[PDB]
Amino acid sequence: KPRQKRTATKAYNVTQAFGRRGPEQTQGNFGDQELIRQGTDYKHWPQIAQFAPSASAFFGMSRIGMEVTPSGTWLTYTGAIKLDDKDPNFKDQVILLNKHIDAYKT
Amino acid sequence: KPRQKRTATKAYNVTQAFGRRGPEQTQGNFGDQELIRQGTDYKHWPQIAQFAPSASAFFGMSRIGMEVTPSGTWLTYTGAIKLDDKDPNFKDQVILLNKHIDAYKT
Ligand SMILES: [Cl-]
């Protein structure tokens, strides 16, 4: 029920769990219409999930901060996950992620 | 094993998995000496892990990008996870995260 622990599915999709996609700093930007509708039921979810960090890696790799704003107290995070450009699936992986980044603008 | 899927423990600690804490863009900044050396064996690891995102929430909550540089092709990410200041453990949660944020500077 805490937002960060939700898992979107067709029965409880990306908008229900995580809000509409959009350009504001408080919004997620990732997902075309079918990923939004299907969440982890999406046809290529495992190929996306392979880039998501474990809890240990989330706190080990990221730059972590905290911010107390008018809306509340936030744990902030930024980081980058390196793709293997030698993987024979590398080009497909780039295509897959680009299909969903800022897809709401199309 | 791909870095984002690693789990640090006493036998394979945060440094071995995720590199030394530091100030640079490629470095994690989170963890005091105890957490670094113990990973998920750390005494308060569950109280930290409760803020890590599920794979679905990682891609649902974060602002996702991609960058190509001489150092590789990168999936970049940023976001903010709200704490519940109505939780009676809220203050101790803020204290715990603050203890580990940039602790390498102390
Ligand atoms: Cl998953």
Swiss-Prot record, chains A, B:
The organism's place on the tree of life at top rank: Viruses
Signal peptide: none
Stretches the record annotates as Putative NLRP3 binding: 4-84
GO molecular function: identical protein binding; MHC class I protein binding; molecular condensate scaffold activity; poly(U) RNA binding; protein homodimerization activity; protein sequestering activity; RNA binding; RNA stem-loop binding
A GO cellular component annotation in the UniProt record: host cell endoplasmic reticulum-Golgi intermediate compartment
Keyword annotations: Acetylation, ADP-ribosylation, Host cytoplasm, Phosphoprotein, Ribonucleoprotein, RNA-binding, Secreted, Transcription, Transcription regulation, Viral nucleoprotein, Virion
Subcellular localization: Virion; Host cytoplasm; Secreted; Host extracellular space
Domain spans labelled CoV N CTD: 1-106
PTM info: ADP-ribosylated. The ADP-ribosylation is retained in the virion during infection.
Region (Dimerization): 2-105
Entry's Gene Ontology BP terms: induction of platelet aggregation in another organism; negative regulation of interferon-beta production; positive regulation of NLRP3 inflammasome complex assembly; response to host immune response; viral RNA genome packaging
Main location: virion
Nuclear localization signal, short sequence motif: residues: 1-8
Presence of the UniProt keyword Mitochondrion in the record: no
Family: Belongs to the betacoronavirus nucleocapsid protein family.
Protein task: Packages the positive strand viral genome RNA into a helical ribonucleocapsid (RNP) and plays a fundamental role during virion assembly through its interactions with the viral genome and membrane protein M. Plays an important role in enhancing the efficiency of subgenomic viral RNA transcription as well as viral replication. Attenuates the stress granules formation by reducing host G3BP1 access to host mRNAs under stress conditions. May block host chemokine function in vivo, facilitating viral replication and transmission. Acts by being secreted into the extracellular space where it competes to host chemokines for binding to host glycosaminoglycans (GAG).
Subunit architecture: Homodimer, homotetramer, homooligomer with RNA. Both monomeric and oligomeric forms interact with RNA. Interacts with protein M. Interacts with protein E. Interacts with NSP3; this interaction serves to tether the genome to the newly translated replicase-transcriptase complex at a very early stage of infection. Interacts with host NLRP3 and ABHD8; these interactions disrupt the association between NLRP3 and ABHD8, increasing NLRP3 stability, ultimately leading to increased inflammasome activation.
Protein name per the record: Nucleoprotein
Species this chain originates from: Severe acute respiratory syndrome coronavirus 2 (2019-nCoV)
Taxonomic lineage of the native organism: Viruses, Riboviria, Orthornavirae, Pisuviricota, Pisoniviricetes
Residues of the full protein shown: 257 to 362 of 419
